[PDB]
Design a protein around this ligand. Sequence first.
Ligand SMILES: Cc1cn([C@H]2C[C@H](O)[C@@H](COP(=O)(O)OP(=O)(O)OP(=O)(O)O)O2)c(=O)[nH]c1=O
Ligand SMILES: Cc1cn([C@H]2C[C@H](O)[C@@H](COP(=O)(O)OP(=O)(O)OP(=O)(O)O)O2)c(=O)[nH]c1=O
Ligand SMILES: Cc1cn([C@H]2C[C@H](O)[C@@H](COP(=O)(O)OP(=O)(O)OP(=O)(O)O)O2)c(=O)[nH]c1=O
Ligand SMILES: [Mg+2]
Ligand SMILES: [Mg+2]
Ligand SMILES: [Mg+2]
Ligand SMILES: [Zn+2]
Lengths: 474, 500, 412
Amino acid sequence: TYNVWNFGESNGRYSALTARGISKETCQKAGYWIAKVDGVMYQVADYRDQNGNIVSQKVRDKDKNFKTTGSHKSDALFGKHLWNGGKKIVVTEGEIDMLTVMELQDCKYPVVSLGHGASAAKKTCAANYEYFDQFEQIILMFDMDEAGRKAVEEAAQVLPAGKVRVAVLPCKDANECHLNGHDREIMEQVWNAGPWIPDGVVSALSLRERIREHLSSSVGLLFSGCTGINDKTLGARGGEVIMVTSGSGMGKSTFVRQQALQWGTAMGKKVGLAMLQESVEETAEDLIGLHNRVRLRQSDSLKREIIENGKFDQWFDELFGNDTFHLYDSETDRLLAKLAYMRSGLGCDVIILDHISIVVSASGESDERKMIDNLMTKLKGFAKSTGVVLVVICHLKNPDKGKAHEEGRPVSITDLRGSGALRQLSDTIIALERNQMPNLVLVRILKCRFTGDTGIAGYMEYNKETGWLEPSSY
Amino acid sequence: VFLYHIPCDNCGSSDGNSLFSDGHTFCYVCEKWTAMTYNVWNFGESNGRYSALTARGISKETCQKAGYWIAKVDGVMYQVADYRDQNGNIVSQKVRDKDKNFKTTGSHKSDALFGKHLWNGGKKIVVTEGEIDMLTVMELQDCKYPVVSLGHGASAAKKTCAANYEYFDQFEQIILMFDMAAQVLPAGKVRVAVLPCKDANECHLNGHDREIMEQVWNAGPWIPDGVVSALSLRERIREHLSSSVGLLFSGCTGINDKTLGARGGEVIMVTSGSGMGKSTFVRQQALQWGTAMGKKVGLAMLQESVEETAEDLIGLHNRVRLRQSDSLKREIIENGKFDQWFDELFGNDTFHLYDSTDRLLAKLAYMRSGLGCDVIILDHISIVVSSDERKMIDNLMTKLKGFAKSTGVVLVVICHLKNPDKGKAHEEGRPVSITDLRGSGALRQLSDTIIALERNQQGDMPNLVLVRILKCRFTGDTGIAGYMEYNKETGWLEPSSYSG
Amino acid sequence: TKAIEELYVELAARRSELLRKLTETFGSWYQPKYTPVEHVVFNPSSRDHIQKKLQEAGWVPTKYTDKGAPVVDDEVLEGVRVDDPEKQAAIDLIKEYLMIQKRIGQSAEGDKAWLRYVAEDGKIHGSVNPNGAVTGRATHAFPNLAQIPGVRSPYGEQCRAAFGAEHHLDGITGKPWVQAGIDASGLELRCLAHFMARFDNGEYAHEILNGDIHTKNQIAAELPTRDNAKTFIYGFLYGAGDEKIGQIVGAGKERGKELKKKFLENTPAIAALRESIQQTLVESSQWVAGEQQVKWKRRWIKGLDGRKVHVRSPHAALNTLLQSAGALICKLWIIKTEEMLVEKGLKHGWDGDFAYMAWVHDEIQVGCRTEEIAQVVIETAQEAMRWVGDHWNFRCLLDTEGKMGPNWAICH
RNA sequence: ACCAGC
DNA sequence: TTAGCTGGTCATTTTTTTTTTTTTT
Ligand SMILES: Cc1cn([C@H]2C[C@H](O)[C@@H](COP(=O)(O)OP(=O)(O)OP(=O)(O)O)O2)c(=O)[nH]c1=O
Ligand SMILES: Cc1cn([C@H]2C[C@H](O)[C@@H](COP(=O)(O)OP(=O)(O)OP(=O)(O)O)O2)c(=O)[nH]c1=O
Ligand SMILES: Cc1cn([C@H]2C[C@H](O)[C@@H](COP(=O)(O)OP(=O)(O)OP(=O)(O)O)O2)c(=O)[nH]c1=O
Ligand SMILES: [Mg+2]
Ligand SMILES: [Mg+2]
Ligand SMILES: [Mg+2]
Ligand SMILES: [Zn+2]
């Protein structure tokens, strides 16, 4: 705080470092020494300019604190003044790493250190562009941490290209490789380092193993109720978005719960339901009677009879014997956190997002379209990063003229309600239509990205006594 | 640490005195031991005495170890609790009294903890929210297991626990005792236990302290959020199975064969043409739900005021037409027969009325929770939506569906129809379709039952109505329900016998 | 670990009831720290508060070990009577509280507790010094696995059932193992019949081999239990006084004299052996009214294998002659009972067929993979002990006894 | 001083 | 003139651009 501390007025001494692994000759060469002020021994490093004049002290205690004695610039490097050229420099992260590298080479290669570290490296590298122009190769030697990789990624932009090489280490940095006897690896990473490879670009030649293992694993997961759906779309796949549409009360949820039953029972996949039309008391209740080929909630006489005889526990045990059903009950930020907890932690493979029109209309926004677009692209980014089968349910809008959508109207692809990016970022669109013959439902495949065949996929019938979607003939 | 025995000098024993590596001795016979304000209260100044708390139960050595000491300054009794650092120095204090007048002195940081200066390594840690529960767990475990506690309440859980991250990282199993929550801690490590009382002190002072210690060594894992599995619902799926009976509609039996009435969490939309008799059918349904089944019914009529619908109910129950006759109103005000009709209806206070977009939902929530109504009736939603009207009516319908869900209340809503494009008018006998509802296209997506009324006022029979179910999400049967004939003398629309 | 955490959560909700029920009986008091006083409460773990509260409730000790204070232990907290019939029931709760406090401090809350020396693989490693005592007896430390409570003390079987060998499921078939425990019978009492067989011509080492010794000694001395007879016989043998063997039955020094005369006039060779040891070691002992000044001749004793066994006091010479010769036969026996098993065609360690687990002063605890290997070990222990008895030419006949079980509660 | 073991 | 051998315990104002409804020329 006061001024540059002189070694005479602070009882200075140039000695070795036993617990770090640095002899006294390298500390005599650089200028790292120890003062005795305020009783406790304080270590101190010296900053010089390009000429060689002392500009700053840096004082560290026994409990790893920092203390600048005065004006701290950004164009001041720890270890810069000793060299004024050369063919190869090694840039470190901390300050003991410079002593570590100059210990093992007997002062033969120019080694500099940063004055801020990895937090403010871009500021001290942008102002130091002119010092690195007189050099021929630059070897960056940072930590093997997240902040170290971020600093070596973001600090190689302001430097001249073609000279910046990055080395890897099995330690944290150079000092643990100096302590643990790994003095044979750090001497090879200086002379032979890794060339340019920024994250984001991938060469087409060095991709053989990933393409080899990628066509080995997924694929499959057939549908149910009809054959033409699997004849045209070839099932549901990881990383896709299948969007099922209908009118009002046309059977857009019954088909999805039937597919959830077939995918949770016949194939053994963990299924995560996000039902927002009803509570969790109902969407786990109808599956019992649907597996037992009846209508459970739609008959009051059978409810008391299965309460009395104890058959309800038998029906609960024969269905939910495995942990294959994860329910959810009802901002748009925490819902994706729930889906990430269902995908990463518990391990779901089929995630159903029912009735999306009450997560874009229940949020307070002035403009609905940008919110729908941002939600859809963030959900697609989630489904592409994790790679999970994701079914999403949305609705239709009002026609301009003619019949209504709930009386046999053939739907078009522009009838999706809310925006026009619901069909641009979805991977399969299935529409269900019927006419109130009140049970003849037809399936229209509007868009398929995997195959190409669209149009009428088939016909089904809804059973009013059991609750299944049976295939018909017509 | 114990090393060996030396002969004692005060008691003159042979193998009584024990020597230790810390330099102090101890004899087991003679029992002789050898060797804001921004102002930290000095121990020699504030008259510090380590007294015990009798009414809660705390020993003296616990207060000597934890630093929870009673000051006798100003002639009163203060309870100073000290906060320290990792080096073991006094940083901040808390002076608490009977009136809870907090006097936080010193540099009170955002990541201060009580009991972090003695306990740095271990396997298990119990974290509480106050200080008395922390002292209770130390009294149960005899001051030898790592227990820390927060210093800013249960509202700074996103700040205090998040700033201390490398401190909690050294331990293998972090057990929480906040309230009977934070996720910033690393996963697979956090356990949360459940106690039958409010905190640990109410379990210690009532005999449940064993159930404290059983929840410490066998604490269950942390379920992250409100998501559930399909096995912990097993009783509640039973409970909803034993609850769920449809309220029967009156006037026609053709509806109840294909609608199964009205249930808990059920928004029922009712519409017709402009002046075709929505309010008459809804008012008759309200009377048959009020005076015949004992269900408490709350009306929220917005077209007319309270007195009109009250007089209409009083006239309607007595099979007459009250407001449409001046002679009957002049008659029943003289002979005193009006209270005989008032007391037979409003005797067991089943009816509650409203006197005329965010305060209305609050008043409906007060009507549901406070008074205890079971069926809520609205009317004429076009005033409430009177920016872009589609967004307003969508947000309104979303809030009404959210209020009807997870409460169990029947919610009857009345709406109108738009101007038709071509053809004839709806009021002259045009059959209505499902996409004729005005305001938006969101009214037919969040309605669980849609009922429409049709009559021909300028045809041959202007008192024969047709009931059309447009949507039924429970059964799935739509179409013409039945036929009802309207009475010009009694106001009772009744089940007719015509076939179309 | 789970079966001792259940015990800790059991009897840590008992000493937090034995203080609530007891501080309302024994009230608090002001004790002098203008006269400064403090409101101190009743702490049952202290032996001053109970002494004060029994002094001011009408009890006279009539036993003064300390010069101004009585002695307070389990043998005077039984023979204590007060006027108030509430305190007569409260004293039993005080004794139970002291027991629970010692149990907790040994098992789980001590600095050297059991739950602070459990490794990652679920096992306890305790240091065993083979020569820690002056008489060649091994010591056990960090923790002491020769000091856990026996099956006669309360909460003893629940503490020895956790120290089992069936808690090691096998690494190749997933099955638990079997434990065999082998104890020697009448060890120092039969070494006595070895050493004094040159005086009474060997007509004492025939009754030991004829039936059990401690049961018939209990019959002859009308003691209540075999453990009390076993405590009394060694108490008489290793030079007691007039009262410390009358205290075993609780009677006075008259019975403490007549039992000494009865078990001295049976075989008049113990006094001759003691006189032989005195004529061998000591030559002169000057008497002081408060001390003892002895001119020594031989401070050491040749043991069974030439080791100079050191003698601390001249009245413990029979002790350091008997137990130092009794520890060495067990020390050779534990070596020979694996020198026969390795040469028989087995493998030592966890990845073999057997493993030693603990060696307390008399018995051994071995854990093995199958019951046939248990039977082979429990056979060859006898042959090892007989080879020990033949290698040094004992005048007696040594014999052991083995048990088989899942844990160290049946195999005690 | 108290407890526990061999 | 004495039972013995061990261990363990404790204290200090204007622009541009998607998407949903409804009159009338
Ligand atoms: C498809 C179909 C459904 N139904 C019945 C079954 C159900 O009771 C109801 C439709 O079931 P739901 O799946 O609940 O209706 P929905 O999802 O189409 O409506 P919403 O947009 O509000 O979510 O109609 C039939 O009777 N015949 C049919 O062909
Ligand atoms: C049912 C019915 C009612 N009426 C009479 C009685 C009613 O009081 C009168 C109309 O009064 P309302 O029923 O109150 O009119 P409305 O609710 O249908 O329309 P809005 O509130 O939007 O104005 O019509 C008939 O003439 N014939 C009929 O069949
Ligand atoms: C009980 C006791 C035994 N000992 C000795 C006797 C033994 O040599 C050894 C172990 O004693 P124990 O094994 O208890 O007795 P024991 O072997 O003679 O009888 P048994 O096995 O048939 O039940 O320590 C003492 O020195 N002091 C004692 O208080
Ligand atoms: Mg649905
Ligand atoms: Mg009206
Ligand atoms: Mg024995
Ligand atoms: Zn002393």
